[PDB]
């Protein structure tokens, strides 16, 4: 049971992963900018296609009775997944970085055609970055009729370090630094932008209370003129974030117009009208925050979902690379080491399941469709069963 427990663990992951990934594959075609997830879904799909072939080798305890070409293709594909997934995640972190830090220069970059062009480069770079895997993917001459399928380094007693370090450096070290750097600039930019709108908004309230207590035409004009400058500044400051530009920009036409409505009355000296005209601005200010809070709540949902996808991958595979670097110092594995090594890989391959599953969970639109789709499909089958059940009564 112990020997056959491990193949069942990977089979459960592959079964869930294939089903889980196909769910996103079907749903998206029928958060992330609708592009990177599609490519990232394929990486799990392609990796899991070769998963059962690798499982049988573990079942055979060193048997690859499937072909030397299969060993070269499948092993490279498995080693390609770490480089492809992280680069796609790195691109997603970079893509969100440009959309929030350099929105003006990234307008042309974020295009449906341009994004697909970058993905093709990432796949090509992934295959280029796994060239050593291609060179030494030949069948291991296992004793007897069986043949092993691994990496045949020319000097395994000496080349083990550089091959292992190169994967960690490029697939787990470098992308984590870039992704983390991208997501600390974004959080600072978002915090600075959100602390700027409320700072400009607070300028309105302080001036707004002046006009209510203002008793002359001179004070009203100066108080309103400060409001308009902040209103224009806040209007231009809206164009600095992704989910804060196509929705928070239209309203400022009313706010600037109403200020101009009061400003013209202030210049004419009709202070009583000017105060009355300014009095209606409190309904604009009261509606300013609600759309701000609604948008600010939504921009945290986008950021958390984007980080959660990236964070899961670099957390599940973190313990595996701990042992991978540890085994460099400790060449001989112990009984606990084998259990830890098997356990770490199981956690690492759990990323196949979470990435489609967690993405659907952290959005109310997808689960609404799934609840809708499941019920109608079952009910359509039930009435089709009824179409046989009422037929059994009638037909």
């Amino acid at each position, epitope marked *: 049971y112990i020997n056959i427990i491990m193949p069942s663990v990977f089979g459960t992951i592959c079964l869930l992963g294939i089903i889980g990934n196909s769910t996103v594959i079907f749903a998206v075609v029928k958060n992330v900018p609708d592009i990177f997830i599609i490519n990232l879904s394929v990486v799990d799909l392609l990796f899991l296609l070769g998963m059962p072939f690798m499982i049988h080798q573990l079942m055979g305890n060193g048997v690859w009775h499937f072909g030397e070409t299969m060993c070269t293709l499948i092993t490279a594909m498995d080693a390609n997944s770490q480089f492809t997934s992280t680069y796609i995640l790195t691109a997603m972190a970079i893509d969100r970085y440009l959309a929030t830090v350099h929105p003006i220069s990234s307008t042309k970059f974020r295009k449906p055609s341009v994004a697909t062009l970058v993905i093709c480069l990432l796949w090509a770079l992934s295959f280029i970055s796994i060239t050593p895997v291609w060179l030494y993917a030949r069948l291991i001459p296992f004793p007897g009729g069986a043949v092993g399928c691994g990496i045949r380094l020319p000097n395994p007693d000496t080349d083990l370090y550089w091959f292992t370090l190169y994967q960690f450096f490029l697939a787990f070290a470098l992308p984590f630094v870039v992704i983390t750097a991208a997501y600390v600039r974004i959080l600072q930019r978002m915090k600075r932008q959100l602390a700027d709108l409320e700072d400009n908004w607070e300028t309105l309230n302080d001036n707004l209370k002046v006009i209510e207590k203002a008793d002359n035409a001179a004070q009203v004009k100066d108080a309103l003129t400060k409001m308009r400058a902040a209103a224009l500044d806040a209007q231009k400051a809206s164009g600095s974030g992704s989910p804060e530009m196509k*929705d*928070f*920009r*239209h*309203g400022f*036409d*009313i706010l600037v*117009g*109403q200020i*101009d*409505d*009061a*400003l*013209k*009355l202030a210049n004419e000296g009709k202070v009583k*009208e000017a105060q*009355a*005209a300014a009095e*209606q601005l409190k*309904t*604009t200010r*009261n*509606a*300013y925050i*609600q*759309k*701000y809070l609604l948008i600010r709540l939504r921009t945290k949902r986008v950021t958390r979902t984007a980080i959660a996808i990236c964070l899961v991958f670099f957390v599940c595979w973190a313990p595996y690379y701990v042992l991978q670097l540890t085994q460099l110092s400790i060449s001989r594995p112990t009984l606990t080491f084998v259990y830890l090594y098997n356990a770490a890989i199981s956690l690492g391959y759990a990323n196949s399941c979470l990435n489609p599953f967690v993405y659907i969970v952290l959005c109310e639109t997808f689960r609404k469709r799934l609840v809708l789709s499941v019920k109608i499909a079952a009910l359509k089958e039930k009435i089709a069963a009824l179409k046989e059940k009422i037929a059994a009564l009638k037909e």
Partner: antibody
Amino acid sequence: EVQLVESGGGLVQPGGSLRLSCAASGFNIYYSSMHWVRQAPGKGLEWVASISPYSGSTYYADSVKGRFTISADTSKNTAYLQMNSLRAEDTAVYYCARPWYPWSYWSGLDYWGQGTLVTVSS
Amino acid sequence: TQSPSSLSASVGDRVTITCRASQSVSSAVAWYQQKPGKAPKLLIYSASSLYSGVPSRFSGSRSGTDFTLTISSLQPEDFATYYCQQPWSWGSALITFGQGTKVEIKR
């Protein structure tokens, strides 16, 4: 008494130009806010555009922004609605209404015109 | 999008016309009455104040995010379609009219 007499409505092919006029009597249009509200046959009231002649600020609805051009003529005490790129759904009855105060359009449009019918059909 | 609702009531009944907003309404709704083939007329402004020429029967309430227009004693000339001016939301149009509620004779 505030009276709002309108004209200019009639037949016009799609893509044509039709300037709707809203004559105003009993008040000065300069210190006011003239709003155009259209009601499609069998549908409810829908806002179109507004203008404040004293300040010059002009607002439009999203569905008609860039196609209409509302303006006012203080000399003739009339408000115009220049309609361009008319479509099939623009067929409605266009009222010109103003609130009691020029800044109280959120408290209701007290005074309403008689309304004019714009029929767009090829 | 949505056809105006139907509210059947007889003469002398106490009708309640309700319009629902997406946020907390704060004295930003006005009620219009439109008879068929006529321009709409204003009934209640500032959601609590009677309008000139409007009897005391019309009165505006406020129940959470829903604002209601109450007619204490329905009259034969009060059978028309009633439109509600939605409180302004950021980014929307300057003035937005809600769906009407047609009040019709009950039999």
